Enzyme design. Structure first.
Site, PDB file in Angstrom:
ATOM      1  N   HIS B 514      39.262  56.934  21.930  1.00 49.11           N
ATOM      2  CA  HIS B 514      37.851  56.547  21.944  1.00 49.11           C
ATOM      3  C   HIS B 514      37.673  55.035  22.128  1.00 49.11           C
ATOM      4  O   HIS B 514      36.701  54.458  21.631  1.00 49.11           O
ATOM      5  CB  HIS B 514      37.127  56.961  20.655  1.00 49.11           C
ATOM      6  CG  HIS B 514      37.021  58.438  20.426  1.00 49.11           C
ATOM      7  ND1 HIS B 514      36.074  58.984  19.582  1.00 49.11           N
ATOM      8  CD2 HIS B 514      37.746  59.481  20.901  1.00 49.11           C
ATOM      9  CE1 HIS B 514      36.221  60.298  19.547  1.00 49.11           C
ATOM     10  NE2 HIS B 514      37.222  60.629  20.346  1.00 49.11           N
ATOM     11  N   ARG B 535      25.522  42.751  33.244  1.00 50.13           N
ATOM     12  CA  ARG B 535      25.999  41.765  34.207  1.00 50.13           C
ATOM     13  C   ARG B 535      27.014  40.829  33.568  1.00 50.13           C
ATOM     14  O   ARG B 535      26.809  40.344  32.455  1.00 50.13           O
ATOM     15  CB  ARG B 535      24.830  40.959  34.775  1.00 50.13           C
ATOM     16  CG  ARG B 535      23.811  41.838  35.454  1.00 50.13           C
ATOM     17  CD  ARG B 535      22.581  41.038  35.813  1.00 50.13           C
ATOM     18  NE  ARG B 535      21.863  40.612  34.619  1.00 50.13           N
ATOM     19  CZ  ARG B 535      20.569  40.307  34.606  1.00 50.13           C
ATOM     20  NH1 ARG B 535      19.863  40.381  35.729  1.00 50.13           N
ATOM     21  NH2 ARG B 535      19.982  39.931  33.476  1.00 50.13           N
TER      22      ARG B 535
HETATM   23  C1  LIG Z   1      41.766  63.146  25.088  1.00 46.39           C
HETATM   24  C2  LIG Z   1      40.313  62.750  25.058  1.00 46.39           C
HETATM   25  C3  LIG Z   1      39.401  63.571  24.405  1.00 46.39           C
HETATM   26  C4  LIG Z   1      38.046  63.240  24.351  1.00 46.39           C
HETATM   27  N1  LIG Z   1      37.176  64.120  23.716  1.00 46.39           N
HETATM   28  C5  LIG Z   1      35.901  63.816  23.688  1.00 46.39           C
HETATM   29  C6  LIG Z   1      35.000  64.729  23.013  1.00 46.39           C
HETATM   30  O1  LIG Z   1      35.328  65.777  22.457  1.00 46.39           O
HETATM   31  N2  LIG Z   1      33.670  64.330  23.032  1.00 46.39           N
HETATM   32  C7  LIG Z   1      33.168  63.188  23.638  1.00 46.39           C
HETATM   33  O2  LIG Z   1      31.945  62.978  23.574  1.00 46.39           O
HETATM   34  N3  LIG Z   1      34.028  62.329  24.272  1.00 46.39           N
HETATM   35  C8  LIG Z   1      35.329  62.640  24.294  1.00 46.39           C
HETATM   36  N4  LIG Z   1      36.204  61.806  24.983  1.00 46.39           N
HETATM   37  C9  LIG Z   1      35.687  60.552  25.543  1.00 46.39           C
HETATM   38  C10 LIG Z   1      35.018  60.671  26.904  1.00 46.39           C
HETATM   39  O3  LIG Z   1      35.623  61.703  27.683  1.00 46.39           O
HETATM   40  C11 LIG Z   1      35.181  59.322  27.607  1.00 46.39           C
HETATM   41  O4  LIG Z   1      34.842  58.279  26.698  1.00 46.39           O
HETATM   42  C12 LIG Z   1      34.425  59.083  28.912  1.00 46.39           C
HETATM   43  O5  LIG Z   1      34.932  59.978  29.908  1.00 46.39           O
HETATM   44  C13 LIG Z   1      34.600  57.620  29.266  1.00 46.39           C
HETATM   45  O6  LIG Z   1      33.799  57.289  30.419  1.00 46.39           O
HETATM   46  P1  LIG Z   1      34.133  56.019  31.288  1.00 46.39           P
HETATM   47  O7  LIG Z   1      33.245  56.088  32.532  1.00 46.39           O
HETATM   48  O8  LIG Z   1      34.033  54.803  30.441  1.00 46.39           O
HETATM   49  O9  LIG Z   1      35.655  56.197  31.761  1.00 46.39           O
HETATM   50  P2  LIG Z   1      36.438  57.424  32.388  1.00 46.39           P
HETATM   51  O10 LIG Z   1      35.619  58.678  32.229  1.00 46.39           O
HETATM   52  O11 LIG Z   1      37.811  57.465  31.835  1.00 46.39           O
HETATM   53  O12 LIG Z   1      36.557  57.103  33.968  1.00 46.39           O
HETATM   54  C14 LIG Z   1      37.475  56.115  34.479  1.00 46.39           C
HETATM   55  C15 LIG Z   1      37.852  56.561  35.878  1.00 46.39           C
HETATM   56  O13 LIG Z   1      38.387  55.453  36.644  1.00 46.39           O
HETATM   57  C16 LIG Z   1      39.560  55.864  37.317  1.00 46.39           C
HETATM   58  N5  LIG Z   1      40.377  54.666  37.531  1.00 46.39           N
HETATM   59  C17 LIG Z   1      41.264  54.075  36.669  1.00 46.39           C
HETATM   60  N6  LIG Z   1      41.813  52.976  37.135  1.00 46.39           N
HETATM   61  C18 LIG Z   1      41.234  52.825  38.385  1.00 46.39           C
HETATM   62  C19 LIG Z   1      41.364  51.839  39.383  1.00 46.39           C
HETATM   63  N7  LIG Z   1      42.170  50.780  39.287  1.00 46.39           N
HETATM   64  N8  LIG Z   1      40.636  51.989  40.510  1.00 46.39           N
HETATM   65  C20 LIG Z   1      39.828  53.044  40.621  1.00 46.39           C
HETATM   66  N9  LIG Z   1      39.627  54.037  39.753  1.00 46.39           N
HETATM   67  C21 LIG Z   1      40.342  53.854  38.637  1.00 46.39           C
HETATM   68  C22 LIG Z   1      40.162  56.944  36.420  1.00 46.39           C
HETATM   69  O14 LIG Z   1      41.064  57.787  37.124  1.00 46.39           O
HETATM   70  C23 LIG Z   1      38.895  57.677  35.949  1.00 46.39           C
HETATM   71  O15 LIG Z   1      38.420  58.693  36.826  1.00 46.39           O
HETATM   72  C24 LIG Z   1      37.593  62.077  25.000  1.00 46.39           C
HETATM   73  C25 LIG Z   1      38.503  61.251  25.655  1.00 46.39           C
HETATM   74  C26 LIG Z   1      39.860  61.576  25.691  1.00 46.39           C
HETATM   75  C27 LIG Z   1      40.819  60.675  26.429  1.00 46.39           C
END
Ligand SMILES: Cc1cc2nc3c(=O)[nH]c(=O)nc-3n(C[C@H](O)[C@H](O)[C@H](O)COP(=O)(O)OP(=O)(O)OC[C@H]3O[C@@H](n4cnc5c(N)ncnc54)[C@H](O)[C@@H]3O)c2cc1C
Ligand SMILES: *[C@@H]1O[C@H](CO)[C@@H](O[C@@H]2O[C@H](CO)[C@@H](O[C@@H]3O[C@H](CO[C@H]4O[C@H](CO)[C@@H](O)[C@H](O[C@H]5O[C@H](CO)[C@@H](O)[C@H](O)[C@@H]5O)[C@@H]4O)[C@@H](O)[C@H](O[C@H]4O[C@H](CO)[C@@H](O)[C@H](O)[C@@H]4O)[C@@H]3O)[C@H](O)[C@H]2NC(C)=O)[C@H](O)[C@H]1NC(C)=O
Ligand SMILES: *[C@@H]1O[C@H](CO)[C@@H](O[C@@H]2O[C@H](CO)[C@@H](O[C@@H]3O[C@H](CO[C@H]4O[C@H](CO)[C@@H](O)[C@H](O[C@H]5O[C@H](CO)[C@@H](O)[C@H](O)[C@@H]5O)[C@@H]4O)[C@@H](O)[C@H](O[C@H]4O[C@H](CO)[C@@H](O)[C@H](O)[C@@H]4O)[C@@H]3O)[C@H](O)[C@H]2NC(C)=O)[C@H](O)[C@H]1NC(C)=O
Ligand SMILES: Cc1cc2nc3c(=O)[nH]c(=O)nc-3n(C[C@H](O)[C@H](O)[C@H](O)COP(=O)(O)OP(=O)(O)OC[C@H]3O[C@@H](n4cnc5c(N)ncnc54)[C@H](O)[C@@H]3O)c2cc1C
Ligand SMILES: *[C@@H]1O[C@H](CO)[C@@H](O)[C@H](O)[C@H]1NC(C)=O
Ligand SMILES: *[C@@H]1O[C@H](CO)[C@@H](O)[C@H](O)[C@H]1NC(C)=O
Ligand SMILES: *[C@@H]1O[C@H](CO)[C@@H](O)[C@H](O)[C@H]1NC(C)=O
Ligand SMILES: *[C@@H]1O[C@H](CO)[C@@H](O)[C@H](O)[C@H]1NC(C)=O
Ligand SMILES: *[C@@H]1O[C@H](CO)[C@@H](O)[C@H](O)[C@H]1NC(C)=O
Ligand SMILES: *[C@@H]1O[C@H](CO)[C@@H](O)[C@H](O)[C@H]1NC(C)=O
Ligand SMILES: *[C@@H]1O[C@H](CO)[C@@H](O)[C@H](O)[C@H]1NC(C)=O
Ligand SMILES: *[C@@H]1O[C@H](CO)[C@@H](O)[C@H](O)[C@H]1NC(C)=O
Ligand SMILES: *[C@@H]1O[C@H](CO)[C@@H](O)[C@H](O)[C@H]1NC(C)=O
Ligand SMILES: *[C@@H]1O[C@H](CO)[C@@H](O)[C@H](O)[C@H]1NC(C)=O
Ligand SMILES: *[C@@H]1O[C@H](CO)[C@@H](O)[C@H](O)[C@H]1NC(C)=O
Lengths: 581, 581
Positions: B514, B535
């Site tokens: 998280h 920003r």
């Molecule tokens: C194991 C696990 C269980 C979870 N369970 C829950 C739950 O039960 N309930 C809940 O509410 N939340 C849960 N979460 C949290 C939630 O899924 C995430 O916090 C959310 O998906 C984060 O959104 P984000 O856009 O910040 O990043 P992410 O959704 O992680 O998106 C990042 C993306 O960028 C891509 N990427 C990485 N590096 C690069 C790069 N250099 N260039 C281009 N693309 C890149 C990745 O492949 C990915 O697709 C869980 C997370 C994990 C890991």
């Protein structure tokens, strides 16, 4: 330069034909690629998941930066199953890029015991596979440099009859230009007090005692990774093509004849986004011991009990992925007095009795009575398929220990400001497996289980060898330099007995990353996957040429053998090519 | 189909100009991409390291297959530094594909406490960022379904006033077709005997007690990942383009006499093999909390003390990568009697006093006296740069605990044939960091250190909440179903006190995945990296829109908040677009 030569677009090779496709541009794959393209009429395509790294900087080129590359895009970092011994997941370091694990390894250059390689012909029915033939290929690959006065004074000994000086792989003494620590000669003196030999050339066929060793580097100390040594001098050959950044997914097979024929491969990066290329002569698998068996399984070559629950059709049934043999490594570390300063590495190749000390009698008794039971238990755990055939392996290890007195454990010493031992039992009796867990090769979803410490002699021997490493650090001349232990330190009482070490060791070990045996070179009826020419049983034009094929561990670091093994296989491939002209 | 519409050749994209470039096709990236391209004149390019995964099968689409995808190519598996609490490296699970971690997560759908979101405006000076605004965006994103009679009989309660039913993300009760286990209502009965509330709707803004919850899935139980929900309905928009299989390496910045502007990004797979693409309006970073700070650092945006030794000119000096906040998770598991069979998940959201029990007075005494000392110690470890600014965060946390009585730990119950708790302290006081270790983005050589348990209340709180899970597992109506504990089991005495738990917990925990805070949304003079429209300070046309920017943890699962946050940022981005027409 070489960078401009690499292919990166899959569409520039898709649907074409070459003579030989090599899956994996690592140690064995690049050796064979160079030998084959010496003939300008033979075309070779190497397909490698990583790319060129040899010119990156010290993180690759300085052997003293060892381990900083771990966790990066140059490390596959394969994950084991949740290991039964400690309920933890372990990481398997493995080079990702041209040169493979020679990009990321410790550079240590030694050979095993003569009787160990000889058993490949006497026990494992491999015509022409013996110390003499393998060592001759080893020397032909080698370009070694004798140590100078400074290096000899530190503790080096070099018998020139055991080294080639005209070959391809540059090797010599590691020398940071610093002074060499006296601790190396101090450890030698400490074991001489026990009647243990010192300064045997670990390249000559009897690795036993405490010695220094050459390293795979140029005289200017640049790492001699397999790409620098075998690809950089030859990349301008138009018949040698290298596609980087792509994974080989499966072998393409003929549906035609009595027995299937390898006619090419599918490669790519993701499901629905893959391409074909055709091999006119042969497909050679060189993706590493953790991978080449999975490529076979994705192609329908493996165990029906494994492939059928995944929805993969079995076209050739073989015990692919079994017999996996890797070692366990633990650490003892101590601070040194100011007098101990300096560079230098050395290792104690310790015999069974030297390893077990007071427990020698009880350990010999286990080895003399438990082989049948141990084999049944490993087969039940899925590490091997046939108890009778596994027992052949165990009888061979007992002869190595009891009749030949080969080294049983390795105690590896680093100085450069401290006294630090990495310790591993060289001859594990446990057997593990690697198997795919999905039909999609580009998902890379697999179960890799070395079954560390699920054989009781493996745990006893590891605990005894690590206890010995603590012992010898504060014994004899080594007392002069001892300034207090930091590992285990607080975590294990300094006067712990063997039982206490046995309780501690499962929670303080790493994989050794020496995995062999997942496509073992032995007769089919013994559980083998390839014949004495590395050909997969029941398939035409298909070989596994890499660390998957050694049927045993060995009392050494493996590069001296793998370079030799690649050249031996290249001669067989070229002999079959010649017979068709 | 969507598969044919995706771009997979980097040369189809190189050299184009588009209005917005989104780095990362994850949760927030895909939400913002969908919002922006509702205007047919606005062009968006999403660049994603993974590919499309929502049609793969159960390993993705079945929430009950949670965890089997770990270690595959759909899992980044970032390795931490070797942790100080236990001298082990840990793995950070993180989704790699269109949808990001929504592809691999547990699917749990809950909201935090009203006062926690209000603090983003009141303490961290983010105008408009309060519970009323964020919740309204959350309900707008949400497409929830009320539970039916079977689901209510199992323990579900659903307040229609707290849920949107006409939005985009399908959410409702998990239902495998089995009977629901009576263990859920047993756990409710057991905490009722202690005066703890039950069945509160954890979407309403006061998450406390034992409740069931909706899941991110359709009624036929298909996972509602961000790509299925936001990209699959909209991939035919011509102005929406998606490049898969490629990493964004760095932001392209103008270099002249005026303030640096984001004019594009460089993307690729390896140092020899990258490309540019031009952004006419903005670059938006959405690569995840572990990655987007490193993209800034690779571009010269970050701390001079980090960038300069790497040979990277510091263009904008910001505390990028600091303030990382992740939680620690441990397990208690026991067998159940035949009568406990069935499906079902629940969670106890436990206040500070509920988790600490008989240690409450001592825990409160620590919280009252040690805030300044703790902030000094976190700063000295490199988890944050300004002690006073961190003390502001700690005071906010103390108010949450003492004045608002928010949930302090979460005990997550799984049944389906056993009784298994995953336990985590929700509000860690430790502060970690992530920093690049090399100038080459495609090497992905970085140091990621959440500093787990290096703050003593965090260790004490996690020990107490896990002991509480053991306690309640055999208390009240739960005793009816208790059939022996298996974890810790033999690894910790069943009557262990808090001190004994404190010894065991560092060797029996995992990251919660998280992690937030590494590009914190707060004023520059409090250590922030982005303003209230996301920003980056000091740069024109560049935002960070993902889990890097929340300045606090929260007592909930974060998807309800991250969908709303993305929608709220999209509105700010679109308001600036309308200002330039
Ligand atoms: C194991 C696990 C269980 C979870 N369970 C829950 C739950 O039960 N309930 C809940 O509410 N939340 C849960 N979460 C949290 C939630 O899924 C995430 O916090 C959310 O998906 C984060 O959104 P984000 O856009 O910040 O990043 P992410 O959704 O992680 O998106 C990042 C993306 O960028 C891509 N990427 C990485 N590096 C690069 C790069 N250099 N260039 C281009 N693309 C890149 C990745 O492949 C990915 O697709 C869980 C997370 C994990 C890991
Ligand atoms: C993870 O792993 C690390 C090491 O990799 C562990 O850290 C080490 O723990 C051991 C204990 O198990 C420490 O060894 C002790 O050393 C002290 C005296 O050392 C002092 O003096 C040194 C030079 O004279 C100096 O370099 C040291 O400074 C470092 O350490 C301090 C605190 O550890 C730190 O604050 C500094 O910043 C430096 O990093 C140090 O101040 C000595 O008193 C101990 O002796 C005991 O044991 C001997 C047995 O030989 C016995 O004879 C004595 O009676 C005494 O009881 C012991 O040797 C070591 O210093 C630690 N650090 C390093 C770098 O090795 C760490 O504990 C592990 N974490 C876990 C397991 O969770
Ligand atoms: C790794 O992690 C696993 C858990 O995932 C650990 O394995 C478990 O260990 C615990 C002990 O710590 C075991 O719990 C005990 O169970 C026995 C009796 O179990 C028997 O009955 C089960 C059906 O009711 C049956 O499924 C069991 O069979 C499995 O397990 C055994 C090993 O136990 C194995 O041989 C089989 O092949 C099966 O895999 C088994 O037949 C019970 O005697 C214990 O009771 C204790 O606690 C009670 C009250 O709490 C107390 O009153 C008693 O006095 C007694 O002290 C205890 O419940 C569990 O069975 C193991 N297996 C699981 C959970 O699958 C493993 O140890 C870890 N390895 C490490 C840490 O290295
Ligand atoms: C940490 C470490 C330290 C070591 N230290 C020593 C030492 O001191 N001394 C010593 O003698 N030996 C040492 N070794 C061992 C030695 O480096 C290896 O045994 C040797 O490199 C193995 O050669 P190989 O041809 O079997 O495979 P590798 O050299 O591993 O090459 C396999 C190649 O295939 C590529 N690949 C993988 N999957 C695919 C795919 N699907 N498609 C295409 N390509 C693929 C990989 O990227 C890699 O380049 C060490 C190994 C490790 C990991
Ligand atoms: C050196 O190697 C050769 C070949 O093994 C051997 O004949 C000789 O005895 C060895 N030792 C010395 C000191 O020459
Ligand atoms: C590629 O691979 C297989 C051959 O087994 C087949 O599906 C296909 O026809 C081949 N050729 C092309 C052009 O895809
Ligand atoms: C090793 O130990 C066994 C039994 O203790 C003994 O018979 C043997 O001679 C010893 N020495 C060697 C070199 O094997
Ligand atoms: C180490 O081994 C020697 C071998 O004889 C023994 O005498 C000694 O007691 C052992 N222990 C220590 C701490 O040296
Ligand atoms: C099992 O191994 C033995 C030894 O090689 C062999 O004789 C026997 O035929 C094998 N059985 C099978 C089914 O392979
Ligand atoms: C439902 O939600 C509304 C809004 O928070 C609240 O006023 C009401 O008391 C809640 N509970 C019930 C039982 O309606
Ligand atoms: C500097 O670059 C910016 C952004 O590309 C541009 O708008 C501005 O005109 C440039 N300034 C000068 C002085 O060239
Ligand atoms: C890409 O950008 C770099 C510098 O920003 C520069 O080398 C080049 O002009 C651009 N285009 C290409 C095709 O490299
Ligand atoms: C919690 O405990 C403290 C004393 O330790 C007490 O002041 C407080 O009233 C208790 N209850 C709540 C809801 O905080
Ligand atoms: C469990 O919790 C209750 C409530 O605090 C307490 O009375 C009891 O002593 C605790 N311990 C056990 C072993 O039940
Ligand atoms: C540290 O933060 C405090 C509180 O925001 C602020 O008053 C002070 O100016 C900051 N100090 C520095 C050096 O940034």
């Amino acid at each position: 330069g070489i960078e401009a030569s690499l292919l990166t677009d899959p569409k520039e090779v898709a649907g074409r034909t070459v003579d030989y496709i090599i899956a994996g541009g690592g140690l064995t794959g690049l050796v064979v690629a160079a030998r084959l393209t010496e003939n300008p009429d033979i075309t070779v395509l190497v397909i490698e998941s990583g790319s060129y790294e040899s010119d990156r900087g010290p993180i690759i080129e300085d052997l003293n930066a060892y381990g900083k590359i771990f966790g990066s895009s140059v490390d596959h970092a394969y994950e084991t199953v949740c290991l039964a011994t400690n309920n933890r997941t372990a990481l398997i370091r493995a080079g990702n890029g041209l040169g493979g694990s020679t990009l990321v390894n410790g550079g240590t250059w030694t050979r095993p015991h003569k009787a160990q390689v000889d058993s490949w012909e006497t026990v494992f029915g491999n015509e022409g596979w013996n110390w003499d033939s393998v060592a001759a290929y080893s020397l032909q690959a080698e370009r070694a440099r004798a140590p100078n006065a400074k290096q000899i004074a530190a503790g080096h000994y070099f018998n020139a009859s055991c080294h080639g000086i005209n070959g391809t792989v540059h090797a010599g003494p590691r020398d940071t230009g610093d002074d060499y620590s006296p601790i190396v000669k101090a450890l030698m003196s400490a074991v001489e007090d026990r009647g243990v030999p010192t300064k045997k050339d670990l390249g000559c066929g009897d690795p036993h005692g405490v010695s220094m060793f050459p390293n795979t580097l140029h005289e200017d100390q640049v790492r001699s990774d397999a790409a620098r040594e075998w690809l950089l001098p030859n990349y301008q050959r138009p018949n040698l093509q290298v596609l980087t950044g792509q994974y080989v997914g499966k072998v393409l097979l003929s549906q035609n004849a009595t027995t299937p024929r390898a006619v090419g491969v599918e490669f790519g990066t993701h499901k629905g986004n893959f391409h074909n290329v055709t091999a006119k002569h042969e497909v050679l698998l060189a993706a590493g011991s953790a991978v080449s068996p999975t490529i076979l399984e994705y192609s329908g070559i493996g165990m029906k009990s494994i492939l059928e629950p995944l929805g993969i059709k079995t076209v050739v049934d073989l015990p692919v992925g079994l017999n996996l043999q890797d070692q366990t490594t633990s650490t003892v570390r101590s601070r040194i007095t100011s007098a101990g300063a300096g560079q230098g590495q050395a290792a104690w190749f310790a015999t069974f009795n030297e390893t077990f000390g007071d427990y020698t009698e009880k350990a010999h008794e286990l080895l003399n009575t438990k082989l049948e039971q141990w084999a049944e238990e490993a087969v039940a755990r899925g590490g091997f398929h046939n108890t009778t055939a596994l027992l052949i392996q165990y009888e061979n290890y007992r002869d190595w220990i009891v009749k030949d007195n080969v080294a049983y454990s390795e105690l590896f010493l680093d100085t450069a400001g401290e006294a630090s031992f990495d310790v591993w039992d060289l001859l594990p009796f446990t057997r593990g497996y690697v198997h795919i867990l999905d039909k999609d090769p580009y998902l890379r979803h697999f179960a890799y289980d070395p079954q560390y410490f699920l054989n009781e002699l493996d745990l006893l021997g590891q605990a005894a060898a690590t206890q010995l490493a603590r012992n010898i650090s504060n014994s004899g001349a080594m007392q002069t330099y001892f300034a207090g232990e930091t590992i285990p330190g607080d975590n294990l009482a300094y006067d712990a007995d063997l039982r206490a070490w046995v309780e501690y060791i499962p929670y303080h070990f790493r994989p050794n990353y020496h995995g062999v045996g997942t496509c073992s070179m032995m007769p089919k009826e013994m559980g083998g996957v390839v014949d004495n020419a590395a050909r997969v049983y029941g398939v035409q034009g298909l070989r596994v040429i890499d660390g998957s094929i050694p049927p045993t561990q060995m009392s050494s670091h493996v590069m001296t053998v793998f370079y030799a093994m690649a050249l031996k296989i290249a001669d067989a491939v070229l002999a079959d090519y010649a017979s068709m002209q």
